[PDB]
RNA sequence: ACGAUUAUAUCC
RNA sequence: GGAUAUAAU
């Protein structure tokens, strides 16, 4: 029922080309685990990825009360080995979403058409240039070379400056213009990030899919305009937040909460990219209806031949050593495509609008839309669609919706039938809604209204303190380190004083870390540094300069631009709120840690060696 | 060898 | 503008 039906007239040449370069080892394993993906063959390969973690000695030594807290100490780097990847693959990528019902599809298509038109009122699809690509791509961006003709260069920078790289692009750009595709294949790797381990094992996290550099240009050429012209900015899309930094997102939530409506809902979707249906992809492609000429053909080539027909190359442990599987999947979002963020935001705006529609009873059944319901839907979009859009903040899969009323919480038949099944809740269990916008999660944070001593008001980002301390105590790599990650620890402290200055433990811990890290060191990478013989790196005073720059000078929501003169003027959350968000104030282990903080600082100093040190601790009493 | 999109800090 | 670091989807 759920097996994948490949279109070999479209993906056929790609698979043959991969096979041709690997005839020595190409077989057809009949023990392949793929249940929902078409499988095409395997061949020998070598293991890539990692599952180890390095300890950040300076931060661990300075956060002792948290040694006894498993929400801190179980933090690890993810497992990006093929073992780690196949786990994630069996858990979430190797799944199938049921085709939505005919009423759902009519609802999605109507809404997507109205959305593309609203997004396009003040923007125009356009091609992007090779010069634009050459200026944007990082010099060390992955080449991701699939075939040997593509493995000539040592960096993306070198590749983009060779006319031979652009000859490969031209060969394939010409195929796309005829409607054929021969080289656009996805690499696959696991996302390296920080995730809580369980049972002494580091966990995988997610799949990252990337085509080779030439195919990524071709993506960019046809579809980069969604990003480069900022289609999903809040100004253009009403719901998006593209371009707004994390720290300013609380200001958007406060404005959404000014609206009249029900609770504030922020239902996460479980494995959003794996739940993108071919219906979703075909509604996304409707942007080509606003294109012309050569552009329309290149976009359509990308959507049809590379997004709706993906050939993937993924590693897999097998008792005879690691192999590489050549699989294929017509739906899903390939997390790594140029459209990932933007089209995730698009479809998630479309899904939330529909859920709002269900809540208001515009339509009543997803099995079929009556003509009078199609009329009601279109007239609803015309009448209120733009206002319903502004009741949302949507950053790809992450969303906050303040609906008209709380019928939303139990309006789940369209949401579930589109595949957008909520995380950590039953299919038909009503949603949990916040009636206080400062408690709403959005992009892994919530936001507090912080009154300053002037009486001015900041909105500041905040999360459970154990997540922050956990992440600061580990890094990529292996084993233990002290000197090699001291500047990294100072980097974390700088983040803490700028974004979470309002948490007592974090502001104490940050000053302690700065007091312990040699003050003339400057990071040149995660594990390397240089010594400015006469400049101190990021003293107290220029940390306070950064704080005033971000929260006052450049803060559009701060009218009075009067600087703050002293770290002691910069306030904290109220104690109860600090505690509610994981503060250890009130615990005796923390009062001890604090009272004796200079001892631990002097201990780290001695372990690092004889260097010049500065005491950031008098910034607080 | 190291995805896309984006913010901030730093260094050049 | 680039690189690094961090963070977010
Ligand atoms: N490093 C990342 C993280 C996320 N995303 C995109 O943003 C979507 C939503 O991100 P998130 O909600 O953090 O992950 P999910 O895939 O939803 O996984 P889960 O919610 O199960 O943690 C992902 O599906 C992915 O397509 C991405 O491109 N790159
Ligand atoms: Mg999700
Ligand atoms: Mg989130
Ligand atoms: Zn192609
Ligand atoms: Zn908080």
XYZ file of C-alpha atoms (C1' of nucleotides) and ligand atoms in Angstrom:
675
model
C 0.000 0.000 0.000
C 2.804 2.382 0.983
C 5.565 1.344 -1.409
C 7.184 3.917 -3.687
C 6.490 3.909 -7.465
C 9.550 5.436 -9.220
C 9.271 7.267 -12.549
C 12.253 5.734 -14.298
C 11.740 7.788 -17.428
C 12.795 10.748 -15.234
C 15.269 9.377 -12.678
C 16.544 6.574 -14.884
C 19.606 8.181 -16.468
C 20.871 9.401 -13.061
C 20.817 5.916 -11.536
C 22.529 4.429 -14.569
C 25.258 7.084 -14.400
C 25.918 6.341 -10.733
C 25.941 2.609 -11.505
C 28.356 3.104 -14.420
C 30.915 4.712 -12.141
C 30.584 1.866 -9.654
C 30.256 -1.350 -11.680
C 32.955 -3.076 -9.598
C 30.717 -3.103 -6.521
C 27.193 -2.427 -7.789
C 24.752 -5.061 -6.551
C 21.062 -5.283 -5.621
C 20.973 -6.156 -1.942
C 17.676 -7.891 -1.212
C 18.246 -7.211 2.530
C 17.786 -3.448 2.098
C 15.676 -1.894 4.890
C 13.826 0.613 2.738
C 10.073 0.154 3.186
C 8.696 3.416 1.694
C 11.528 4.395 -0.654
C 12.299 2.902 -4.037
C 15.660 1.136 -3.781
C 17.895 0.771 -6.821
C 21.207 -0.775 -5.752
C 24.264 -0.449 -3.550
C 28.057 -0.359 -3.778
C 31.029 -0.254 -1.441
C 31.894 3.030 0.269
C 33.760 4.315 3.316
C 32.250 5.424 6.603
C 31.711 9.161 7.080
C 30.338 10.910 10.127
C 30.982 11.020 13.831
C 29.285 10.241 17.129
C 31.801 11.610 19.615
C 31.655 14.721 21.810
C 34.329 16.924 23.314
C 33.990 18.330 26.833
C 34.520 22.087 27.220
C 36.623 22.005 30.360
C 36.388 25.675 31.220
C 32.587 25.695 31.228
C 32.225 22.345 33.019
C 34.685 23.441 35.695
C 32.722 26.656 36.203
C 29.201 25.146 36.345
C 29.577 22.562 39.119
C 26.009 22.724 40.594
C 24.803 21.461 37.173
C 26.983 18.332 37.286
C 24.136 16.652 39.209
C 21.391 17.619 36.694
C 20.812 15.091 33.870
C 19.125 17.655 31.640
C 22.588 19.231 31.479
C 24.976 16.308 31.697
C 23.265 14.057 29.141
C 23.840 16.640 26.360
C 25.880 15.249 23.464
C 26.774 15.737 19.852
C 24.460 13.854 17.533
C 25.458 10.590 15.853
C 26.134 11.282 12.189
C 27.669 7.878 11.429
C 25.640 5.710 9.037
C 24.370 3.821 12.099
C 23.071 7.137 13.468
C 21.683 8.014 10.040
C 19.882 4.722 9.449
C 18.240 5.075 12.860
C 16.834 8.477 11.880
C 15.992 7.041 8.473
C 13.940 4.161 9.893
C 12.365 6.384 12.546
C 11.251 9.317 10.393
C 12.492 9.427 6.776
C 11.311 5.901 5.849
C 7.629 6.605 6.430
C 4.686 7.377 4.168
C 1.923 9.949 4.424
C -1.501 8.970 3.121
C -2.722 10.913 0.097
C -5.096 13.612 1.385
C -8.777 13.437 0.605
C -10.316 15.255 -2.335
C -11.839 17.964 -0.146
C -8.426 18.563 1.410
C -6.701 18.923 -1.954
C -9.294 21.408 -3.200
C -8.750 23.341 0.032
C -4.964 23.315 -0.351
C -4.993 24.234 -4.048
C -7.432 27.122 -3.521
C -5.390 28.405 -0.589
C -2.012 27.992 -2.317
C -3.247 29.892 -5.399
C -4.507 32.713 -3.202
C -1.238 32.739 -1.288
C 1.025 32.891 -4.324
C -1.097 35.765 -5.591
C -0.845 37.601 -2.242
C 2.893 36.958 -1.986
C 3.306 38.166 -5.564
C 1.361 41.430 -5.308
C 4.585 43.326 -4.628
C 7.192 40.883 -5.894
C 7.994 39.300 -9.208
C 9.620 35.916 -9.808
C 12.975 36.365 -11.487
C 16.094 34.424 -12.314
C 19.250 34.680 -10.271
C 22.650 35.033 -11.918
C 25.942 33.180 -11.799
C 27.511 36.363 -10.420
C 24.925 36.456 -7.623
C 25.705 32.793 -6.896
C 29.456 33.393 -6.953
C 29.113 36.214 -4.426
C 26.772 34.250 -2.156
C 28.230 30.765 -1.903
C 30.645 30.258 0.979
C 34.150 29.535 -0.243
C 34.156 26.206 1.642
C 30.603 25.184 0.783
C 30.405 21.474 0.038
C 31.076 20.539 -3.533
C 29.085 17.361 -2.940
C 30.529 15.825 -6.080
C 28.481 12.788 -7.125
C 30.251 11.841 -10.382
C 33.964 11.910 -11.203
C 33.696 14.708 -13.769
C 32.626 16.861 -10.801
C 35.452 15.929 -8.407
C 38.034 18.315 -9.858
C 38.041 21.185 -7.336
C 39.205 21.582 -3.736
C 36.717 24.314 -2.720
C 33.556 25.932 -3.985
C 35.580 29.117 -4.494
C 38.023 27.363 -6.816
C 35.152 25.589 -8.567
C 33.154 28.754 -9.260
C 36.210 30.468 -10.787
C 36.907 27.635 -13.260
C 35.084 27.864 -16.579
C 35.043 24.062 -16.656
C 32.778 23.996 -13.626
C 30.393 26.241 -15.577
C 30.618 23.906 -18.558
C 29.171 21.063 -16.462
C 26.414 23.438 -15.367
C 25.737 24.406 -18.988
C 25.488 20.753 -20.100
C 22.875 20.102 -17.447
C 21.117 23.436 -17.716
C 20.539 22.510 -21.373
C 19.035 19.161 -20.403
C 16.685 20.952 -17.978
C 15.548 23.244 -20.772
C 14.592 20.122 -22.796
C 12.838 18.624 -19.779
C 15.495 16.039 -18.897
C 17.840 15.668 -15.945
C 20.981 13.572 -15.709
C 23.215 14.779 -12.866
C 21.072 16.286 -10.056
C 21.549 13.743 -7.250
C 21.369 14.268 -3.461
C 24.104 13.512 -1.027
C 22.911 12.664 2.465
C 24.496 13.330 5.804
C 23.310 13.607 9.358
C 22.841 16.958 11.046
C 25.657 17.565 13.536
C 24.064 19.305 16.520
C 23.650 19.074 20.279
C 20.975 16.656 21.486
C 20.215 14.898 24.782
C 21.616 11.381 24.781
C 19.761 8.418 26.274
C 21.012 5.148 27.771
C 24.625 6.224 27.330
C 24.194 6.630 23.558
C 24.290 9.773 21.430
C 21.263 10.046 19.172
C 20.912 10.866 15.518
C 18.824 13.919 14.784
C 17.862 14.471 11.147
C 18.744 13.966 7.513
C 20.524 16.718 5.531
C 20.201 16.347 1.731
C 22.420 18.296 -0.650
C 22.995 18.088 -4.391
C 26.366 18.942 -5.881
C 27.478 22.565 -6.325
C 26.419 22.740 -9.982
C 22.912 21.500 -9.164
C 22.691 23.887 -6.244
C 23.446 26.748 -8.630
C 20.652 25.474 -10.873
C 18.295 25.476 -7.882
C 19.404 28.991 -6.961
C 19.107 30.222 -10.538
C 15.459 29.153 -10.811
C 14.157 29.554 -7.272
C 16.645 31.608 -5.233
C 14.403 34.602 -5.785
C 12.137 33.351 -2.975
C 15.050 34.086 -0.634
C 17.076 36.790 -2.404
C 14.000 38.992 -2.825
C 12.666 38.108 0.653
C 9.261 36.741 -0.290
C 8.598 35.481 3.257
C 9.496 38.621 5.183
C 6.813 39.753 7.585
C 6.228 42.831 5.427
C 5.548 40.749 2.323
C 3.910 37.621 3.808
C 2.214 38.953 6.983
C 2.939 35.590 8.678
C 6.674 35.175 8.089
C 9.553 36.463 10.171
C 12.299 35.998 7.643
C 15.212 38.267 8.414
C 14.179 39.003 12.021
C 16.788 37.894 14.487
C 15.814 35.437 17.198
C 16.021 38.087 19.917
C 13.467 40.358 18.232
C 10.916 37.558 17.695
C 9.341 38.233 21.097
C 8.286 41.671 19.870
C 6.367 39.998 17.048
C 4.663 37.639 19.486
C 3.562 40.556 21.664
C 1.967 42.223 18.613
C 0.184 39.033 17.529
C -1.144 38.816 21.095
C -2.623 42.333 20.788
C -5.250 40.790 18.479
C -8.653 39.662 19.697
C -8.890 35.902 19.663
C -8.373 32.718 21.621
C -5.300 31.183 23.156
C -1.932 31.234 21.441
C -1.170 27.861 19.849
C 2.266 26.674 18.793
C 1.819 23.060 17.726
C 5.047 21.566 16.444
C 4.876 19.105 13.547
C 6.691 15.790 13.865
C 9.314 15.513 11.134
C 7.831 18.273 8.999
C 10.029 17.625 5.974
C 9.077 13.938 5.850
C 5.376 14.907 5.931
C 5.453 17.050 2.786
C 3.167 15.377 0.274
C 3.264 15.405 -3.484
C 0.160 17.569 -3.162
C 2.226 19.998 -1.101
C 5.039 19.983 -3.698
C 2.608 20.472 -6.553
C 1.004 23.419 -4.798
C 4.433 24.912 -4.157
C 5.261 24.573 -7.851
C 2.293 26.834 -8.687
C 4.747 29.748 -8.375
C 5.780 28.792 -11.938
C 2.386 30.122 -13.067
C 3.781 33.595 -12.298
C 6.898 32.940 -14.424
C 7.627 33.315 -18.116
C 9.879 32.020 -20.841
C 13.240 30.480 -20.093
C 12.704 30.990 -16.349
C 9.428 29.064 -16.250
C 11.191 26.129 -17.908
C 14.140 26.054 -15.512
C 11.941 26.305 -12.431
C 9.653 23.549 -13.721
C 12.726 21.440 -14.425
C 13.759 21.920 -10.784
C 10.336 21.252 -9.237
C 9.467 18.221 -11.410
C 12.807 16.577 -12.103
C 14.731 17.277 -8.882
C 12.125 18.042 -6.186
C 9.276 15.673 -7.130
C 11.696 12.925 -8.245
C 14.738 12.749 -5.996
C 17.606 10.296 -6.310
C 19.439 9.992 -3.027
C 22.747 8.431 -2.082
C 22.828 7.364 1.574
C 25.185 5.266 3.666
C 24.155 2.079 5.465
C 26.206 -0.219 7.684
C 26.164 -3.859 6.560
C 28.251 -6.716 8.032
C 30.588 -6.516 5.006
C 31.461 -2.866 5.846
C 29.648 0.339 4.923
C 27.709 0.449 1.633
C 25.923 3.229 -0.226
C 22.302 2.841 -1.248
C 20.801 4.517 -4.292
C 17.190 5.188 -3.336
C 14.477 7.479 -4.587
C 11.421 9.283 -3.274
C 8.918 11.369 -5.143
C 7.547 13.343 -2.205
C 9.017 14.819 1.005
C 11.022 18.029 1.322
C 14.712 17.495 0.687
C 16.092 19.416 3.682
C 18.947 21.253 1.981
C 17.189 22.449 -1.116
C 17.384 26.183 -1.746
C 13.634 26.361 -1.088
C 13.728 24.610 2.298
C 13.071 27.515 4.621
C 10.941 29.490 2.218
C 8.643 26.776 0.964
C 8.339 25.264 4.454
C 7.060 28.692 5.509
C 4.746 28.770 2.475
C 3.084 25.398 3.054
C 2.944 25.990 6.804
C 1.146 29.285 6.180
C -1.220 27.363 3.912
C -1.860 24.642 6.489
C -2.475 27.049 9.382
C -4.888 29.137 7.289
C -6.847 25.979 6.535
C -6.831 24.926 10.184
C -8.165 28.370 11.022
C -10.834 27.768 8.361
C -11.862 24.491 9.995
C -12.042 26.244 13.351
C -14.456 28.825 11.929
C -16.564 26.233 10.062
C -15.953 27.604 6.548
C -15.901 24.027 5.328
C -17.187 21.090 7.341
C -15.744 17.963 5.695
C -12.404 17.079 4.156
C -13.842 14.280 2.052
C -15.404 16.676 -0.445
C -15.802 20.414 -0.793
C -19.237 21.452 -1.953
C -19.497 24.235 -4.506
C -21.003 26.473 -1.822
C -18.047 25.694 0.461
C -15.522 26.484 -2.290
C -17.364 29.775 -2.656
C -17.319 30.301 1.124
C -13.574 29.525 1.234
C -12.648 31.921 -1.586
C -14.878 34.625 -0.129
C -13.328 33.997 3.295
C -9.802 34.473 1.910
C -10.984 37.614 0.112
C -12.674 38.898 3.241
C -10.351 37.900 6.086
C -7.418 35.944 4.659
C -4.928 38.782 5.094
C -6.020 39.359 8.679
C -5.883 35.633 9.485
C -2.360 35.643 8.103
C -1.319 38.402 10.497
C -2.535 36.349 13.488
C 0.486 34.077 12.846
C 4.250 34.031 13.182
C 5.683 31.268 11.007
C 9.385 30.343 10.644
C 9.252 27.247 8.426
C 7.708 24.475 10.541
C 7.675 26.556 13.755
C 4.423 28.504 14.043
C 2.405 30.537 16.570
C -1.260 31.093 15.714
C -3.698 33.303 17.619
C -6.980 32.149 16.068
C -10.334 33.890 16.179
C -11.514 31.614 18.955
C -10.562 28.298 20.575
C -12.510 26.080 18.176
C -9.037 25.864 16.561
C -7.716 23.577 19.322
C -10.051 20.758 18.198
C -10.091 21.546 14.446
C -7.812 18.691 13.438
C -9.296 16.865 10.470
C -7.684 19.010 7.761
C -4.401 19.248 9.691
C -4.133 15.463 10.057
C -5.265 14.665 6.509
C -2.606 17.009 5.060
C -0.001 14.923 6.898
C 0.903 17.689 9.359
C 0.532 15.491 12.432
C 1.425 17.225 15.682
C 4.362 16.167 17.837
C 3.789 14.764 21.372
C -0.006 14.578 21.313
C -2.579 12.137 20.001
C -3.996 12.549 16.522
C -7.360 13.743 17.917
C -6.332 15.105 21.310
C -7.212 18.855 21.391
C -4.256 21.229 21.267
C -2.687 22.933 24.293
C -2.965 26.714 24.078
C -1.138 29.447 25.968
C -3.180 32.334 27.345
C -0.001 34.288 28.150
C 2.181 35.208 25.200
C 5.309 35.286 27.329
C 5.038 31.505 27.734
C 4.614 30.648 24.035
C 7.529 28.700 22.554
C 8.777 29.902 19.193
C 12.093 28.884 17.641
C 13.015 27.039 20.859
C 12.516 30.127 22.992
C 9.906 32.097 24.825
C 9.994 35.803 25.587
C 9.702 37.926 28.730
C 8.612 41.541 29.132
C 11.498 42.964 31.144
C 11.044 46.357 32.811
C 14.331 48.239 33.153
C 15.294 50.610 35.971
C 14.463 53.577 33.697
C 11.010 52.094 33.324
C 11.663 51.268 29.676
C 10.570 47.846 28.469
C 12.588 45.169 26.717
C 11.226 41.937 25.284
C 14.004 39.388 25.753
C 14.576 35.767 24.730
C 14.615 33.060 27.334
C 14.673 29.273 27.496
C 15.095 26.593 30.095
C 18.456 27.334 31.677
C 19.555 23.682 31.578
C 19.461 23.613 27.773
C 21.847 26.547 27.642
C 24.322 25.214 30.201
C 24.198 21.779 28.610
C 25.065 23.080 25.162
C 27.888 25.297 26.463
C 29.619 22.318 28.123
C 30.222 20.280 24.926
C 31.422 20.789 21.382
C 32.324 18.953 18.207
C 35.346 16.735 18.604
C 36.382 14.148 21.117
C 37.768 13.637 24.566
C 38.340 16.518 26.951
C 39.812 19.961 26.398
C 40.614 23.062 28.407
C 42.925 25.548 26.660
C 41.739 24.592 23.172
C 38.115 25.533 24.040
C 38.650 28.404 26.490
C 37.832 31.007 23.829
C 34.820 28.934 22.796
C 33.696 29.127 26.428
C 34.156 32.897 26.333
C 32.114 32.982 23.127
C 29.294 31.216 24.959
C 29.602 33.649 27.869
C 29.367 36.575 25.440
C 26.185 35.096 24.029
C 24.871 34.685 27.566
C 25.476 38.266 28.642
C 23.944 39.635 25.435
C 20.850 37.404 25.065
C 20.281 35.963 28.571
C 21.849 38.666 30.792
C 18.548 38.586 32.632
C 19.207 35.123 34.181
C 21.248 35.403 37.391
C 23.012 32.061 37.023
C 23.984 32.783 33.433
C 25.260 36.289 34.136
C 27.323 35.026 37.089
C 28.584 32.025 35.118
C 29.474 34.212 32.105
C 31.546 36.668 34.125
C 33.242 33.722 35.844
C 34.124 32.134 32.478
C 35.459 35.447 31.159
C 37.442 35.882 34.386
C 39.033 32.468 33.844
C 39.864 32.625 30.129
C 43.117 34.439 29.235
C 41.993 37.959 28.379
C 44.303 38.585 25.403
C 43.338 35.462 23.462
C 41.200 35.867 20.329
C 39.445 32.915 18.619
C 40.548 32.074 15.089
C 38.496 28.833 15.001
C 36.801 26.542 17.511
C 40.133 25.186 18.717
C 42.715 27.824 17.671
C 43.537 31.323 18.826
C 46.041 34.136 18.458
C 47.350 36.488 21.154
C 46.892 40.265 20.804
C 49.852 41.357 22.976
C 48.300 44.736 23.795
C 44.519 44.410 23.366
C 42.106 42.640 25.679
C 39.412 40.690 23.810
C 35.866 41.665 24.744
C 36.295 43.351 28.106
C 33.370 44.137 30.364
C 33.080 47.592 28.822
C 32.867 46.587 25.194
C 30.478 43.799 26.202
C 28.317 46.577 27.575
C 28.870 48.427 24.294
C 27.467 45.393 22.453
C 24.503 45.231 24.849
C 23.605 48.895 24.246
C 24.144 48.475 20.493
C 21.717 45.549 20.219
C 19.041 46.286 22.828
C 18.990 50.097 22.632
C 20.712 51.607 19.596
C 19.577 49.104 16.941
C 16.364 48.032 18.671
C 13.450 49.407 16.595
C 11.158 48.865 19.582
C 13.289 51.052 21.866
C 12.335 54.697 21.247
C 14.503 56.304 23.929
C 18.052 55.623 22.694
C 19.626 56.566 26.051
C 22.492 54.113 26.707
C 22.805 52.132 29.905
C 25.868 53.220 31.831
C 26.605 50.174 33.969
C 26.124 46.421 33.935
C 24.424 46.834 37.341
C 21.674 48.930 35.685
C 20.754 46.017 33.417
C 18.005 44.155 35.301
C 17.162 40.486 35.822
C 13.910 38.635 35.625
C 12.004 38.427 38.862
C 13.302 35.632 41.066
C 10.156 33.502 40.684
C 10.341 33.877 36.906
C 14.081 33.102 36.863
C 13.301 30.017 38.956
C 10.344 28.964 36.834
C 12.813 28.992 33.895
C 15.297 26.692 35.605
C 17.309 29.017 37.809
C 19.208 27.389 40.635
C 18.941 30.405 42.947
C 17.628 29.158 46.258
C 19.488 25.852 46.061
C 22.332 25.521 48.522
C 24.635 24.064 45.854
C 24.253 27.363 43.992
C 24.793 29.618 47.012
C 28.007 27.678 47.631
C 29.133 27.856 43.979
C 28.532 31.602 43.987
C 30.165 32.373 47.355
C 33.336 30.511 46.291
C 33.334 31.427 42.595
C 36.772 33.078 42.757
C 38.254 29.755 43.935
C 36.982 27.898 40.878
C 38.123 30.778 38.649
C 41.641 30.631 40.127
C 41.588 26.850 39.618
C 40.809 27.136 35.900
C 43.392 29.934 35.589
C 46.095 27.735 37.121
C 45.172 24.827 34.867
C 45.354 26.976 31.735
C 48.781 28.264 32.716
C 50.610 31.545 33.222
C 48.781 34.074 31.040
C 47.349 37.549 31.466
C 43.948 37.415 33.158
C 41.265 40.012 33.848
C 38.530 39.910 36.455
C 35.096 40.492 34.951
C 33.437 39.781 38.338
C 33.208 43.394 39.694
C 30.591 44.114 36.986
C 28.339 42.662 39.741
C 28.403 43.270 43.514
C 35.414 16.158 3.661
C 31.670 19.769 5.940
C 22.914 21.579 3.045
C 19.826 25.664 2.382
C 17.938 30.023 4.714
C 18.718 33.642 8.520
C 20.288 36.705 12.996
C 24.054 38.335 16.256
C 29.125 38.951 17.909
C 34.087 39.005 16.760
C 38.470 39.086 13.738
C 40.421 40.596 9.044
C 32.816 42.110 1.791
C 35.086 37.672 3.775
C 36.398 34.170 7.595
C 35.417 32.407 12.363
C 32.006 31.465 16.485
C 27.378 30.999 18.188
C 22.175 30.457 17.544
C 17.502 29.527 14.877
C 14.037 26.917 10.971
N 18.975 22.277 10.614
C 17.767 22.323 10.061
C 16.652 22.203 10.844
C 15.409 22.266 10.257
N 15.306 22.443 8.946
C 14.003 22.453 8.304
O 13.006 22.908 9.207
C 12.036 21.907 9.456
C 11.500 21.985 10.872
O 12.574 22.014 11.790
P 12.357 21.405 13.229
O 10.927 21.527 13.571
O 13.422 21.933 14.119
O 12.658 19.869 12.927
P 11.584 18.761 12.493
O 12.055 18.232 11.205
O 10.186 19.271 12.635
O 11.899 17.684 13.623
P 11.195 17.579 15.062
O 10.122 18.612 15.096
O 10.720 16.173 15.005
O 12.270 17.837 16.063
C 12.747 20.613 9.177
O 11.823 19.586 8.841
C 13.703 20.983 8.062
O 13.153 20.727 6.774
C 16.467 22.555 8.202
O 16.394 22.708 6.996
N 17.661 22.501 8.763
Mg 8.805 20.008 13.783
Mg 10.680 25.005 17.564
Zn 19.379 17.968 -13.460
Zn 11.907 32.339 30.745
